[PDB]
Amino acid sequence: TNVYADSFVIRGDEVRQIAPGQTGKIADYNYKLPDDFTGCVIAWNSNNL
């Protein structure tokens, strides 16, 4: 019906925090996936930029 595309840049270690229902700094105080999230997490490196 209606999608929300939201993006940001995080570290290569903390991206495993980027799982809904997990802990760690990015999911604790920065950006929070919900308790029931069906969204897809797309992640890649942009080290050359």
Binding site: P20, G21, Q22, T23, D35
Partner: protein
């Protein structure tokens, strides 16, 4: 709830709930069956009475 972060603790509490919630139906079903015996014995009394 104290030890574990909720996202995993959800699955744990299931095994409690599923266990306990089942354990009620066991108890309830027993009472139904057992009451149906008393219900039969009650009529025997009401018949004698």
């Amino acid at each position: 709830l104290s030890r574990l972060d909720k996202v995993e603790a959800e699955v744990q509490i299931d095994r409690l709930i599923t266990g306990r919630l089942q354990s009620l139906q066991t108890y309830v079903t027993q009472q139904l069956i057992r009451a149906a015996e008393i219900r039969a014995s009650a009529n025997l009394a009401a018949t004698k009475m």
